[PDB]
Amino acid sequence: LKVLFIGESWHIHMIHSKGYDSFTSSKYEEGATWLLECLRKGGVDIDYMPAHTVQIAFPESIDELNRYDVIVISDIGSNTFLLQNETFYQLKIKPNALESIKEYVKNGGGLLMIGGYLSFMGIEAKANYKNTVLAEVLPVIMLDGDDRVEKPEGICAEAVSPEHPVVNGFSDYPVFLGYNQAVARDDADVVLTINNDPLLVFGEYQQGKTACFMSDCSPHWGTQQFMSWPFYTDLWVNTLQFIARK
Amino acid sequence: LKVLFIGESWHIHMIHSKGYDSFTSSKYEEGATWLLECLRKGGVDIDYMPAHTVQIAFPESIDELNRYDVIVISDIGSNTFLLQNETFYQLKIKPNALESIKEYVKNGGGLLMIGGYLSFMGIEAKANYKNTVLAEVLPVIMLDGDDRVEKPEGICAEAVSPEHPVVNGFSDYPVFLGYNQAVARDDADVVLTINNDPLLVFGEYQQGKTACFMSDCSPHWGTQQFMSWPFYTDLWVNTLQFIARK
Amino acid sequence: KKLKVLFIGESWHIHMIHSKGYDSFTSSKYEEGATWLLECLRKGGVDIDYMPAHTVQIAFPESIDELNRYDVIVISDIGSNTFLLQNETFYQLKIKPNALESIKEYVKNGGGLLMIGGYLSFMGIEAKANYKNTVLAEVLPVIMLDGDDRVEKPEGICAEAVSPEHPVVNGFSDYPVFLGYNQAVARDDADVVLTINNDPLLVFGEYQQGKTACFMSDCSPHWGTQQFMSWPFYTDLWVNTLQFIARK
Amino acid sequence: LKVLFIGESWHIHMIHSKGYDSFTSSKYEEGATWLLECLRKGGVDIDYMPAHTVQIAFPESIDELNRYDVIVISDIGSNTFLLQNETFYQLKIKPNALESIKEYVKNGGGLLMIGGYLSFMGIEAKANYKNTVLAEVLPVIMLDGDDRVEKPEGICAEAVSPEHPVVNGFSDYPVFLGYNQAVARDDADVVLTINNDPLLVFGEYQQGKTACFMSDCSPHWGTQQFMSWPFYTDLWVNTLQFIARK
Amino acid sequence: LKVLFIGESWHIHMIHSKGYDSFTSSKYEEGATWLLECLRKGGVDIDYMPAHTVQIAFPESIDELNRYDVIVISDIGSNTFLLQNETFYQLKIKPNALESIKEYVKNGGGLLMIGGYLSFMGIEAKANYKNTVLAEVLPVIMLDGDDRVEKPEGICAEAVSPEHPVVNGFSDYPVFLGYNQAVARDDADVVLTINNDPLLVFGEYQQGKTACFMSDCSPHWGTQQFMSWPFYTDLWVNTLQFIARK
Amino acid sequence: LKVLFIGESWHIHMIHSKGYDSFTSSKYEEGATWLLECLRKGGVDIDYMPAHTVQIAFPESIDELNRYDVIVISDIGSNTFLLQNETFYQLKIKPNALESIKEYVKNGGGLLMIGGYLSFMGIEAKANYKNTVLAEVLPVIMLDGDDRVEKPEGICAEAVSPEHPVVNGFSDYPVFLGYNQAVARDDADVVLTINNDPLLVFGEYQQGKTACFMSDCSPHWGTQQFMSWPFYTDLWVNTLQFIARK
Structure with a gap:
């Protein structure tokens, strides 16, 4: 299982x-600690790509993306894919990363988007995915502005399709501190909900398969109850397996 | 009258x-110093909570809040309540500040919102109140984006209910340089207008009474003329008095 | 025929x-974005006053009589906040005439207005240009979106003439590629002359005595390509559209 | 014991x-809350002054300052004192706070400076005390530039006068992760040292007693070992008592 | 009298x-609008060059500079001259503006430098002139770091050579709120002092004449008193005339 | 040849x-991609550590560094080595990276420092190496403040020891747009000069060997002329070999 995991860096x-005065300190972080660890011990082969790597060296042709069974996009906004350094500073004409990913999915590849401030629409609608060529690929329809629902007190997931292969045998569903609000496309399959909204949604796009998880895999929306939940590793392994290229 | 006044700090x-070069200077400031003075001189006992205080020490229990007759919110965005420091940095689960306020009004508490860049939707829609649980509490319906109406040339308040107890006997209304555009709910009382939009609105939320002032109490929108208006204190005292715990 | 045009914006x-x-150093950089265009208009005989964004903040004309000297006003990559929230308004507690009202009255009374697309035009990046929520929206011959209205095309797409006999574009050929544009809907009142990705690109209208135009992409990089700059009809495009909507 | 504690806020x-994208996060913090609480529980009456308050509301009369037995300056640079908002923005003439403080010590009051990035010279020499009218008051002589000594390995303090009233009985001296490098004046008593540099130094300026602690009372220079050290509170209580106006 | 005026813009x-939230506003200001009016009213022919214009369009050859009798430098640091846009971003090799100026004074041109946070050494020594090829042209010797003397209390200027043609028949000198501290030079003439440091200094460099005014022509160091002083216009016109190309 | 290359990232x-408005664009870049490729193609085995990696994953063990024949430090300031994340944010005691590097060289390892804004003293003296434990290792003595010499008009390198193994055979020396100014130690060998200041210096520290190159390997100080100079690779390959363990 060959997975391209994009984002989760800042x-x-x-x-x-x-x-009157100030001094500065600067930091680099990567954010998917418990998740990428869980996936690696679960038999997934991850090629990790930080946001800044998309800017410099996102693959220019679909062949390089074709080796992957699933592409995962988490906490990285459409502007990063669309406004690569060569486009925005170097005056180059460049292939569109989002069309690339679109073609990738059309021809069999899986795609997961995980929720966050820079997923979907996000904080101040910055992720802006709705107004991109990638919107049609996704099994949810986004809101037109900031789409975050902030739940600092926590709120739990519900299984609405408990017999679905990805979640069959799961229970005692955890709590989250937020999600991106979207509306499932009506031909899509909603498996988990949260606060009367979709949380986990599966769809299809020509030959490929799509999933959206509306909350985060890490903090702060992803809570301790979530990552310690007996079925955490199986959720992410099972969703990638479900949408993987055959 | 005991009043909790939240915001007006930056x-x-x-x-x-x-x-080529740049140097920095930094500056803390409070915005409604005049207003708070006028309210104290009109006999109101005010507890002042600046925005950074909300982040560190917002009351976790409704019992702490229930000792106030009115809570006032001005130039402090929904994110400050929802993303307190223990929530955003320390990965704690925290009671919801907006739910607490919502519960407080529910049980007889009065709530005023004063307009500005960080009220209602605000500049770049950053206050973002519409997309929160506090939306249902207010006697106005907000726009989906940036809701500022800028009037650098100035416009007059007009009284569409000169008889309303809160405004009765006022005259010679002052000029403002802007406001947040919203729509008074069907069941609410529009007392003042601005550019034919609502300016002063009163309403109810279960046992509590609610008010929205759509422009600012301070500059630049609340002018010098407004602040040195004969009815300035009366305006603000009368409205706290009107919506106070009974 | 002899055009006096006020060109606003295109600076940062x-x-x-x-x-x-751990450490950071800073460097600060002024640039002007339309040096090429302004040179072309100069050579094409247009009498230009250039007003960078900062100059609107300090010194935008208070008098309508002062605006009335211009045959066309061009606004490019400058947001509505700059016009509405001049320094005397936002910092100095003064009442001040509304720059967008002034521009509106100038159009009502026969002036021309051209808006050129970009990140700080129309709605723009993160909807910051915010023109739809201003008194200028009714003057423009397009209806804007409710949020960020950018269409990014890093691969490029070319303009197309849908009214190639229109005086402004008549005779043009070999239309260039653009890397992006602001998406708007033409008023069903207005004349769409060029399109891009089937969205309007060049649109003409009227507003009381004045005449209006919107060019939905940029005059400069990155949306305006080097190919567009050195396109044989670059000069005539801008010159013809200025001339089409000019006072008289 | 009546003390004016300035700084330890940001x-x-x-x-x-x-x-390509960024979003922002903002927070106010105070660095010495438990220390301050420990001082109050130990009989010290504290007026606490965050650095931003210094810019707004610093005492202009000598008589106001004279009511304090000690003034403490921690992590606030000379610019904050010399460039209050009325001076830097409001273009008013106003009394010099550093002259006020210097005058306060002449008249008998105690002064302590605790080290940190904005004490002494500090990071990029921004605190800049050497070039101010307060330099002559301090019992140490500062470097010409950035005076930090970073010790991420830790270095423990050392008593050179273990018999001095302030540190008599203290033992098991904790580690620090750094300090400001300076030189004790000839007429000054060095009580503790750090990597052979002065750590704690007492002196006099006319009637008033003076003190410099060369590391921080707080993270990260003030280590957790230091925070929890028995005698930690005694050090501060003792030195305050020692330098206080009687 | 033909004069190039550089800087005084930010x-x-x-x-x-x-x-939690922040909003931004950006603001361009020119700082010597008043000075330039006074100077042109004194019949000086001024070409004003803002700092950003130096970055983008500084004259590449000395011929162009020689149309001026005096060059004035105020609140613009040496990095702006040394690190123009083509140098710092475009990888171009180009003429050294500081060398150009120095050559200009060498062959008759006059040079005045006016104090500020971006003059001489300045705040955090950012102006950095001491470490440049221009330092030897100036009739003062700078300090090795931050050279500000901050006087929010105010200090008046004092004439030590009232017989000098520049200040003849000046009296009742205004207050200043700070100045840059420098020394000497041995063969230079100190006309005004400030807090016993030089304020107005004249010297020469080969054929050209030089001047240094150590405080600001503008706020906040240059008070409104100074701005409204009857000899304000005379000071600047006389200094400029005294150093103008013979 | 085994070389750890650190820095050249931002x-x-x-x-x-x-x-009034602003939008933001962010990007990560690397500055020595060319040099690194040249060095790879020239038989050097490089482990490349960008600055942010030093913050997260710097070898705690002196044995880890000992595997390297040379360490190269370029455009990374002392603060990054001294204030790694676990020091600055988590509150942990860590081994001192600079002490490690000193011990490393002391025991036979090679050390090359390359010039720029965040080397030696650098822009606003920010690199700050003079005031650290690494200073005594370097074969040069640094200035006390900003040590840049800007030469936007260009300045040639000159060979003063043309027969030195490192440069023997080189010719047609390229032009540089600046360098850090320092003074060679008496016991050190100055091989190349720039503007009569040292450009290439070699020394020893106990068992180990040291090099300093006072200008940049990359733009803007390192011109296009330098980077495509025939001896560009030989310069760096030769100097690495000359100071290598041993």
């Missing part, structure tokens, strides 16, 4: 202001 | 660029 | 924070 | 860049 | 953090 | 202000 610039 | 970081 | 001030591990 | 300013 | 990026 | 966050 560069924080901190300005510490003390009265 | 930390400015200024980056001054002179050609 | 980048602050760059260069983070190297 | 606002960050977090820019989170995920590929 | 672009400010303001980050207004209201709790 | 994340840019760009704030584009157009009038």
Whole structure:
């Protein structure tokens, strides 16, 4: 099982202001710690690609993407795919990464999007996925502005399709502190809900298969109850297996 | 009258660029110093909670809140309540501040929202109140995006209910330089208008009474003329009095 | 025939924070974005006043009589906030005439208005240009989207003439590629002359005595390609459209 | 014992860049809350002043300052004192706070400076105390530039006068992760050292007693070992008592 | 009298953090609008070159600079001259603007430098002129770091050579709120001092004449008193006339 | 030949202000991709550690560094080595990276420092190496502040020891757009000069060998002329060999 995992990286610039003055500290992080560990011990072969790597060296032809059984996109916005460094600074004409991913799915590849501030529409609608060529590929329809539902008190998932292969045999469903609100396309399969909204949704796109998980795999939307839940590793392994190219 | 007044505080970081170079200066400031003085001189006992205080120490129990007759919210966005520091950084599960306020009004508490860049939807829709559980509490319906109406040339408030107890006897209404555009709910009372949009609106949410002032109590939208208006204190005192716990 | 045009916008001030591990140094960079275009209009006989964004903040004309001297006003890559929230308004507590009202009255009374697309035009990036929620929306011959209205095409797509006999574009050929545009809907009132990805690209209208135009992509990179800049009809396009909508 | 404790507060300013895009996060924090609570529980009456308050509301009269037995300055640079908002933005003439403090010590009051990134010279020499009218008041002589000594390995303190009233009885000296490098003046008593540099130093300036602790009372220089060290509270209580106006 | 006036412009990026959220406003200002009016009213022919214009369009050859009798440098650091856009971003090799200026003074041109945060050494020594090829042209010797003397209390200027043609028949000198501290030079003439440091200094460099005014022509160091002083226009016109190309 | 190459990486966050408004674009870049490729093709086996990796994963063990024949430090400041994430954010005691590097060289390892804004002292003295435990290892003595010499007009390298093994045979020396200014130690060998200042210096520290190259390997200081100079690879390959363990 060959998986391309894109995103879950950030560069924080901190300005510490003390009265009149300030000094800065800068940091690089990667965010999918418990998830990529769970996937690796679960038999998945991950090629990890940080957001900044998309900007410099996203594959220019579909053949390179074709080796992957699933592509995962998490906490990385459409602007990163569409406005690669060569496009935005170097005045080049470049192949469209999102059309590439679209073609990839058309011809058999799986696609998962995991929720977050830079997934779907996201914080201040920055992820902007709705207004891109990738919107039609996805089994949910996005809202037109900021789509976050913030639940700092926590709220739990429900199985609505408990007999579905991905979640059959699961129970005692965990709690989340937020998600992106979207509306499942009506030909899609909703498997888990949250707060009267979809949480886990499967669809199809020509030959390929699609999944959306509307919450996060890590903090803060993903809680301790979530990552310690007996069925955490199986959720992500099972969803990738379900949508993998055959 | 005991009143909790939340917001009207900011930390400015200024980056001054002179050609190639830049130096910084930083500045904390409070915005409704005049208003709070007028309210205290009109006999109101005010507990002032600046925005950073919400982040560190917002009351977790409705019992703490129930000792207030009115809570006022001005220039502080929904994210500040929902994403407190223990939530966003320390990975804690925290009671929901907006639910707490919602519960407080439910049980006889009065709620005022004052307009500004960080009220209602606000600049770039950053206040984002429409997409929250507090939306249902307010006597107005907000727009889906940035809801500012900028009027640098100034427009007058107009009284469409000159007889309303809160505004009775006022005259010579002042000029404002902008407001948040919203739609008064069907069951709410429009007392004042601005550019024919609602300006002062009153309503109910179970046992509690609600109010929205659609422009600012402070500059630049709340003008010098507004702040030194004879009815300025009356306006604000009368409205707290009107929606106070009975 | 002899055009006096006010060209507003097409300037910016980048602050760059260069983070190297723990540390950062900064460099700050002014640029102007339409030097090429302005040179072409100069050579094509247009009398141009250039007003960068910062100059609208300090010194936008308060008098309509002062605007009335211009045959056309061009707005490009400058947001509505810049016009509405001049320094005296936002910092200095003054009442001040509304720049967008002034522009509106200038059009009502026979002035021309051209808006050129970009990140700080129409709605633009993150909807910051925000023109739909301003008193200028009714003046334009297009209806904007409710959010971010960019269509990014890194692979490029070419413009197409849907009214190739229209005076402005008559005789043009070999239309160039663009890397993006602002998506809008033409008023069913207006004349769509060029399209891009089947969306309007060049649109003409009227507003009381004045005449209006919208070009939905950029005059400059990255949306305006080098191919577009050196396209044989670049000059005539902008010159003809200025001339089409000019006062008289 | 009546003490004016200045500083140990900051606002960050977090820019989170995920590929092309970024979103921001902001928080105010206070660094010495438990220390301050420990001082109050140990009989010290504290007026606490976050750095931003210094810019808004610093005492202009000598008589106001004279009511304090000690003033403490921690992680707030000279610019904050010299460039209050009325000076830097409001273009008003106003009393010099550093002259006020210097005058306060002449008249008998105690002064302690705790090290950190915005004490002494500090990071990029931004604190800049050496170039101010307060330099002559301090019992140490500062470097010409950035005076940090970073010790991420840790280094333990050392008593050179273990018999001094302030540190008599103390034992098991904890580690620090750094300090500001300076030189004790000839007329000054060095009580603790750090990597052979002064760590704790007492002196006099006319009637007033003075003190410098060269590391931080807080993270990260003040280690967890230091926070929890028996005598940690005693160090602070003792040095305050020692330098206090009687 | 033909004069090139460089600097006195900045672009400010303001980050207004209201709790979790922040909004931004950017602001361009020119700082010597008043000075330039006074100078042109004194019949000086001024070409004004903002800092950003130096970045983008500084004259490449000395011929163009020689149309000026004096060059004035105010609140623009040496990095702006040394690191123009083509140099720093476009990989081009180009003429050294600081060398050009120095050559200009060498062959008759006059040079005045006016103090500020981006003059001489300046705030955090960012202006950095001491470490440049221009330092030897100036009739003062700078300090090795931050050279600001901050005087929010105010200090008046004092004439030590009232007989000098520049200040003849000036009296009642205004207050200033700070200045850059420098020394000497031995063969230079100090006309005004400030807090016993030089304020207005004249010297020469080969054929050209030089001047340094150590404080600001503008706020906040240059107070509104100074701005409204009857000899404000006379000071600047006389200094310019005194150093103009003979 | 086994070489650890550290630095030459940065994340840019760009704030584009157009009038009142701004949008942001961010990008990670690497600056020595060319050099690294040249060195690979020239028989050097490189482990490349970008700055952010030093913050997360710097060899705690002196035995880890001992596997390397040379360590190269370029455009990365002392602070990054000293203030790794677990030091600065988590509150953990860590081995001192600079002490490790010193021990490493002391025991026979090679050390090359390449010039730029975040080397030696650098821009605003930010690299700060002079005030660290690594300073005594380097074969040069650094200035006390900003040590840049900007030469936008270009300046040639010169050979002063043409017969030195590192440069023997080189000719037609390229032009540089700047360098850090330092002074060679008496016991060290100066092989190349720039503007009469040292450009290439070799030394020893106990068993180990040291090199310093005072200009940049990359733009803008390192011109296109330098980078495509026939001896470009030989310069770096030769210097690595000359200082290699041993």
